[PDB]
Protein backbone atom coordinates (compact mmCIF):
# COMPACT_ATOMS: atom_id res chain seq x y z
CA UNK A 1 0.00 0.00 0.00
CA UNK A 2 1.16 3.51 -0.81
CA UNK A 3 -0.24 6.98 -0.30
CA UNK A 4 -2.45 8.25 -3.12
CA UNK A 5 -1.16 11.81 -2.62
CA UNK A 6 2.11 13.41 -1.50
CA UNK A 7 3.83 10.03 -1.72
CA UNK A 8 7.00 11.55 -3.18
CA UNK A 9 7.48 14.66 -1.02
CA UNK A 10 10.38 13.29 1.01
CA UNK A 11 11.94 11.50 -1.99
CA UNK A 12 12.47 14.83 -3.75
CA UNK A 13 13.66 16.92 -0.86
CA UNK A 14 17.29 16.89 0.28
CA UNK A 15 18.08 14.28 2.89
CA UNK A 16 18.59 16.89 5.61
CA UNK A 17 14.86 17.64 5.41
CA UNK A 18 13.78 14.21 6.68
CA UNK A 19 17.06 13.04 8.29
CA UNK A 20 16.08 14.02 11.82
CA UNK A 21 18.76 11.84 13.45
CA UNK A 22 21.37 14.26 12.05
CA UNK A 23 19.81 17.42 13.48
CA UNK A 24 22.02 19.44 15.85
CA UNK A 25 20.02 21.54 18.31
CA UNK A 26 20.96 25.18 18.98
CA UNK A 27 19.90 25.64 22.61
CA UNK A 28 18.22 28.83 23.78
CA UNK A 29 18.30 30.36 27.24
CA UNK A 30 16.55 28.33 29.96
CA UNK A 31 15.80 31.40 32.09
CA UNK A 32 13.95 33.29 29.34
CA UNK A 33 10.81 31.32 30.23
CA UNK A 34 9.23 30.89 33.65
CA UNK A 35 6.54 28.41 34.62
CA UNK A 36 3.26 30.04 35.68
CA UNK A 37 0.90 27.07 36.07
CA UNK A 38 0.49 23.49 34.93
CA UNK A 39 -1.84 23.09 31.97
CA UNK A 40 -1.56 19.49 30.85
CA UNK A 41 0.36 16.26 30.98
CA UNK A 42 0.83 13.02 29.08
CA UNK A 43 3.02 9.95 28.98
CA UNK A 44 5.96 11.85 27.45
CA UNK A 45 5.57 15.46 28.54
CA UNK A 46 4.33 17.89 31.12
CA UNK A 47 2.99 21.19 29.80
CA UNK A 48 2.86 24.55 31.57
CA UNK A 49 1.59 28.02 30.87
CA UNK A 50 4.76 30.08 30.82
CA UNK A 51 5.82 33.69 30.54
CA UNK A 52 8.59 35.07 28.34
CA UNK A 53 10.55 37.30 30.70
CA UNK A 54 11.83 39.51 27.87
CA UNK A 55 8.49 40.66 26.41
CA UNK A 56 6.14 39.43 29.19
CA UNK A 57 4.14 37.57 26.54
CA UNK A 58 2.62 34.22 27.42
CA UNK A 59 4.07 30.96 26.12
CA UNK A 60 3.82 27.20 26.54
CA UNK A 61 6.69 25.35 28.24
CA UNK A 62 6.66 21.66 27.24
CA UNK A 63 9.01 19.71 29.53
CA UNK A 64 9.84 16.34 27.97
CA UNK A 65 9.84 13.22 30.12
CA UNK A 66 12.95 11.00 29.78
CA UNK A 67 12.86 9.24 26.40
CA UNK A 68 15.31 8.21 23.69
CA UNK A 69 17.10 11.15 22.05
CA UNK A 70 15.69 9.98 18.68
CA UNK A 71 12.09 10.84 19.58
CA UNK A 72 13.26 14.31 20.69
CA UNK A 73 15.03 15.23 17.47
CA UNK A 74 12.09 13.79 15.53
CA UNK A 75 9.54 16.12 17.14
CA UNK A 76 11.88 19.13 16.89
CA UNK A 77 12.75 18.47 13.25
CA UNK A 78 9.08 18.12 12.31
CA UNK A 79 8.02 21.26 14.18
CA UNK A 80 10.77 23.25 12.45
CA UNK A 81 9.62 21.96 9.05
CA UNK A 82 5.96 22.84 9.67
CA UNK A 83 6.49 26.26 11.35
CA UNK A 84 4.39 28.83 9.49
CA UNK A 85 1.93 26.24 8.22
CA UNK A 86 -1.76 27.04 8.66
CA UNK A 87 -2.92 26.17 12.18
CA UNK A 88 0.34 24.34 13.09
CA UNK A 89 1.58 25.10 16.59
CA UNK A 90 4.64 27.35 16.36
CA UNK A 91 7.85 26.16 17.98
CA UNK A 92 9.44 29.31 19.39
CA UNK A 93 12.53 28.05 21.22
CA UNK A 94 14.28 24.99 22.64
CA UNK A 95 16.03 25.06 26.04
CA UNK A 96 17.43 22.69 28.63
CA UNK A 97 18.08 22.68 32.36
CA UNK A 98 21.84 22.86 32.86
CA UNK A 99 22.20 20.33 35.70
CA UNK A 100 20.00 17.57 34.21
CA UNK A 101 19.81 18.58 30.50
CA UNK A 102 16.08 17.89 30.58
CA UNK A 103 14.85 19.63 27.39
CA UNK A 104 11.86 21.94 27.11
CA UNK A 105 10.09 23.05 23.94
CA UNK A 106 8.72 26.60 23.96
CA UNK A 107 5.57 27.31 21.94
CA UNK A 108 3.04 30.05 21.37
CA UNK A 109 0.26 29.94 23.98
CA UNK A 110 -3.34 29.08 23.11
CA UNK A 111 -6.00 30.01 25.66
CA UNK A 112 -7.70 26.67 25.15
CA UNK A 113 -11.10 25.53 26.38
CA UNK A 114 -10.86 21.80 27.02
CA UNK A 115 -12.88 19.85 24.48
CA UNK A 116 -14.91 18.04 27.15
CA UNK A 117 -16.29 21.45 28.10
CA UNK A 118 -16.13 23.16 24.68
CA UNK A 119 -17.62 20.65 22.25
CA UNK A 120 -21.14 20.40 23.79
CA UNK A 121 -21.21 24.22 23.43
CA UNK A 122 -20.50 24.37 19.68
CA UNK A 123 -23.20 25.23 17.17
CA UNK A 124 -23.54 23.27 13.93
CA UNK A 125 -21.62 25.98 12.08
CA UNK A 126 -18.88 26.03 14.73
CA UNK A 127 -18.32 22.30 14.24
CA UNK A 128 -17.98 22.78 10.48
CA UNK A 129 -15.60 25.70 10.95
CA UNK A 130 -13.21 24.11 13.45
CA UNK A 131 -13.06 20.80 11.56
CA UNK A 132 -12.28 22.88 8.46
CA UNK A 133 -9.49 24.67 10.35
CA UNK A 134 -8.12 21.27 11.44
CA UNK A 135 -8.26 20.00 7.86
CA UNK A 136 -6.03 22.91 6.80
CA UNK A 137 -3.37 21.76 9.25
CA UNK A 138 -3.62 18.16 8.11
CA UNK A 139 -3.44 18.98 4.39
CA UNK A 140 -0.40 21.16 5.04
CA UNK A 141 1.55 18.65 7.12
CA UNK A 142 0.65 15.86 4.68
CA UNK A 143 1.80 18.10 1.83
CA UNK A 144 5.10 18.55 3.70
CA UNK A 145 5.56 14.78 3.96
CA UNK A 146 4.52 14.28 7.62
CA UNK A 147 1.88 12.10 9.31
CA UNK A 148 0.71 13.42 12.67
CA UNK A 149 -0.39 9.97 13.94
CA UNK A 150 -2.12 11.28 17.08
CA UNK A 151 -5.14 13.25 15.92
CA UNK A 152 -7.67 13.59 18.75
CA UNK A 153 -9.48 16.44 20.52
CA UNK A 154 -6.81 16.51 23.26
CA UNK A 155 -4.33 17.59 20.56
CA UNK A 156 -6.44 20.38 19.02
CA UNK A 157 -6.20 23.65 20.95
CA UNK A 158 -9.09 26.08 20.45
CA UNK A 159 -9.42 29.65 21.69
CA UNK A 160 -13.15 29.91 21.08
CA UNK A 161 -13.19 33.69 21.56
CA UNK A 162 -10.55 34.32 18.88
CA UNK A 163 -11.78 31.35 16.79
CA UNK A 164 -8.15 30.18 16.57
CA UNK A 165 -7.18 26.50 16.21
CA UNK A 166 -3.77 24.85 16.56
CA UNK A 167 -2.82 21.21 15.99
CA UNK A 168 -0.45 20.34 18.84
CA UNK A 169 1.78 17.55 20.29
CA UNK A 170 3.83 16.32 17.32
CA UNK A 171 5.75 13.83 19.51
CA UNK A 172 4.32 10.84 17.61
CA UNK A 173 4.41 12.44 14.13
CA UNK A 174 6.60 10.82 11.49
CA UNK A 175 7.91 11.34 7.96
CA UNK A 176 6.10 9.37 5.24
CA UNK A 177 8.37 7.27 3.03
CA UNK A 178 6.58 5.11 0.42
CA UNK A 179 6.82 1.45 1.41
CA UNK A 180 8.09 1.91 4.97
CA UNK A 181 6.58 -0.33 7.64
CA UNK A 182 5.72 1.77 10.69
CA UNK A 183 4.96 1.07 14.33
CA UNK A 184 1.24 0.41 14.80
CA UNK A 185 1.54 1.40 18.48
CA UNK A 186 0.76 5.02 17.68
CA UNK A 187 -2.28 7.28 18.09
CA UNK A 188 -4.57 6.91 21.10
CA UNK A 189 -6.68 3.77 21.24
CA UNK A 190 -10.09 5.31 20.47
CA UNK A 191 -8.65 6.96 17.35
CA UNK A 192 -6.52 4.16 15.91
CA UNK A 193 -7.41 3.26 12.35
CA UNK A 194 -8.29 -0.30 11.43
CA UNK A 195 -4.88 -0.56 9.78
CA UNK A 196 -3.28 -0.16 13.20
CA UNK A 197 -5.65 -2.70 14.73
CA UNK A 198 -4.95 -5.41 12.13
CA UNK A 199 -1.18 -4.80 12.09
CA UNK A 200 -1.06 -3.31 8.58
CA UNK A 201 2.25 -1.50 9.00
CA UNK A 202 2.62 0.28 5.62
CA UNK A 203 0.02 2.92 6.43
CA UNK A 204 0.15 6.57 5.32
CA UNK A 205 -1.38 10.03 5.81
CA UNK A 206 -4.85 8.47 5.55
CA UNK A 207 -4.46 7.18 9.12
CA UNK A 208 -4.98 10.78 10.27
CA UNK A 209 -8.22 10.93 8.30
CA UNK A 210 -9.67 7.98 10.21
CA UNK A 211 -8.73 9.68 13.49
CA UNK A 212 -10.40 12.85 12.22
CA UNK A 213 -13.51 10.86 11.33
CA UNK A 214 -13.61 9.45 14.86
CA UNK A 215 -13.31 12.96 16.30
CA UNK A 216 -16.02 14.19 13.91
CA UNK A 217 -18.46 11.36 14.70
CA UNK A 218 -17.91 12.08 18.38
CA UNK A 219 -18.88 15.72 17.84
CA UNK A 220 -21.98 15.37 15.68
CA UNK A 221 -23.39 12.35 17.56
CA UNK A 222 -22.27 13.59 21.03
CA UNK A 223 -20.83 10.16 21.77
CA UNK A 224 -17.28 10.68 23.03
CA UNK A 225 -15.31 8.65 22.28
CA UNK A 226 -17.33 7.28 19.38
CA UNK A 227 -15.57 3.88 19.31
CA UNK A 228 -14.97 2.95 22.95
CA UNK A 229 -12.78 -0.13 23.14
CA UNK A 230 -11.17 -1.24 26.39
CA UNK A 231 -8.02 -2.60 24.72
CA UNK A 232 -6.78 -2.90 21.14
CA UNK A 233 -8.68 -6.11 20.33
CA UNK A 234 -11.91 -4.64 21.73
CA UNK A 235 -11.45 -1.43 19.75
CA UNK A 236 -11.63 -3.38 16.49
CA UNK A 237 -14.72 -5.23 17.70
CA UNK A 238 -16.35 -1.87 18.40
CA UNK A 239 -15.52 -0.66 14.88
CA UNK A 240 -16.75 -3.88 13.26
CA UNK A 241 -19.99 -3.69 15.28
CA UNK A 242 -20.65 -0.40 13.39
CA UNK A 243 -19.15 -0.69 9.90
CA UNK A 244 -20.18 -4.35 9.62
CA UNK A 245 -17.93 -7.38 9.21
CA UNK A 246 -18.61 -7.90 5.49
CA UNK A 247 -16.70 -4.69 4.77
CA UNK A 248 -13.99 -5.86 7.16
CA UNK A 249 -13.55 -9.13 5.26
CA UNK A 250 -13.00 -7.50 1.88
CA UNK A 251 -10.51 -5.11 3.50
CA UNK A 252 -8.55 -8.01 5.00
CA UNK A 253 -8.60 -9.97 1.74
CA UNK A 254 -7.60 -7.01 -0.44
CA UNK A 255 -4.45 -6.38 1.63
CA UNK A 256 -3.94 -10.09 2.43
CA UNK A 257 -4.16 -9.90 6.23
CA UNK A 258 -5.47 -12.73 8.36
CA UNK A 259 -6.67 -11.91 11.86
CA UNK A 260 -5.38 -13.74 14.90
CA UNK A 261 -7.86 -16.53 15.76
CA UNK A 262 -8.56 -14.98 19.18
CA UNK A 263 -9.19 -11.60 17.55
CA UNK A 264 -11.20 -13.21 14.74
CA UNK A 265 -13.55 -15.01 17.13
CA UNK A 266 -13.95 -11.82 19.19
CA UNK A 267 -14.99 -9.81 16.14
CA UNK A 268 -17.52 -12.46 15.12
CA UNK A 269 -19.95 -11.36 12.43
CA UNK A 270 -22.02 -8.16 12.38
CA UNK A 271 -24.13 -6.39 9.81
CA UNK A 272 -23.39 -2.75 9.11
CA UNK A 273 -25.32 -0.22 11.20
CA UNK A 274 -26.46 2.88 9.28
CA UNK A 275 -25.23 6.22 10.58
CA UNK A 276 -28.79 7.41 11.30
CA UNK A 277 -29.10 4.82 14.10
CA UNK A 278 -26.92 7.13 16.23
CA UNK A 279 -29.18 10.17 15.89
CA UNK A 280 -31.27 11.12 18.91
CA UNK A 281 -33.05 14.18 20.27
CA UNK A 282 -29.76 15.50 21.68
CA UNK A 283 -27.59 15.36 18.52
CA UNK A 284 -30.39 15.63 15.94
CA UNK A 285 -29.62 19.28 15.15
CA UNK A 286 -26.05 18.31 14.12
CA UNK A 287 -26.68 15.24 11.96
CA UNK A 288 -27.62 16.44 8.47
CA UNK A 289 -27.35 14.46 5.20
CA UNK A 290 -24.11 16.28 4.35
CA UNK A 291 -22.48 15.58 7.74
CA UNK A 292 -23.38 11.91 7.31
CA UNK A 293 -22.11 11.78 3.74
CA UNK A 294 -18.88 13.42 4.88
CA UNK A 295 -18.44 11.11 7.88
CA UNK A 296 -19.20 8.08 5.73
CA UNK A 297 -16.33 9.05 3.41
CA UNK A 298 -13.84 9.28 6.32
CA UNK A 299 -14.70 6.12 8.29
CA UNK A 300 -13.83 3.47 5.72
CA UNK A 301 -11.85 0.34 6.57
CA UNK A 302 -9.82 0.81 3.38
CA UNK A 303 -7.40 3.65 4.06
CA UNK A 304 -7.03 4.11 0.30
CA UNK A 305 -10.78 4.86 -0.02
CA UNK A 306 -10.97 7.63 2.59
CA UNK A 307 -11.04 11.27 1.56
CA UNK A 308 -7.75 13.08 1.46
CA UNK A 309 -7.53 16.22 3.57
CA UNK A 310 -7.62 18.32 0.40
CA UNK A 311 -10.75 16.55 -0.88
CA UNK A 312 -12.44 16.75 2.52
CA UNK A 313 -12.09 20.53 2.53
CA UNK A 314 -14.11 20.78 -0.72
CA UNK A 315 -16.98 18.59 0.51
CA UNK A 316 -20.30 20.50 0.32
CA UNK A 317 -20.58 20.10 4.10
CA UNK A 318 -18.10 22.99 4.33
CA UNK A 319 -19.61 25.23 1.62
CA UNK A 320 -20.79 27.91 4.05
CA UNK A 321 -17.37 27.98 5.77
CA UNK A 322 -15.61 28.39 2.41
CA UNK A 323 -18.06 31.13 1.40
CA UNK A 324 -17.33 33.10 4.57
CA UNK A 325 -13.63 32.82 3.76
Ligand SMILES: N#C/C(=C\c1ccc(O)c(O)c1)C(N)=O
Nearest residue numbers: 040060107109110112168169170
Ligand atom coordinates in the same frame (compact mmCIF):
# COMPACT_ATOMS: atom_id res chain seq x y z
N1 LIG B 1 -1.65 21.97 26.28
C1 LIG B 1 -1.36 22.82 25.60
C2 LIG B 1 -0.98 23.98 24.72
C3 LIG B 1 -0.02 23.97 23.83
C4 LIG B 1 0.89 22.83 23.41
C5 LIG B 1 1.73 23.10 22.35
C6 LIG B 1 2.58 22.10 21.84
C7 LIG B 1 2.54 20.83 22.39
O1 LIG B 1 3.43 19.81 21.86
C8 LIG B 1 1.69 20.55 23.45
O2 LIG B 1 1.67 19.32 24.00
C9 LIG B 1 0.84 21.56 23.96
C10 LIG B 1 -1.77 25.29 24.83
N2 LIG B 1 -2.95 25.39 25.76
O3 LIG B 1 -1.47 26.22 24.12
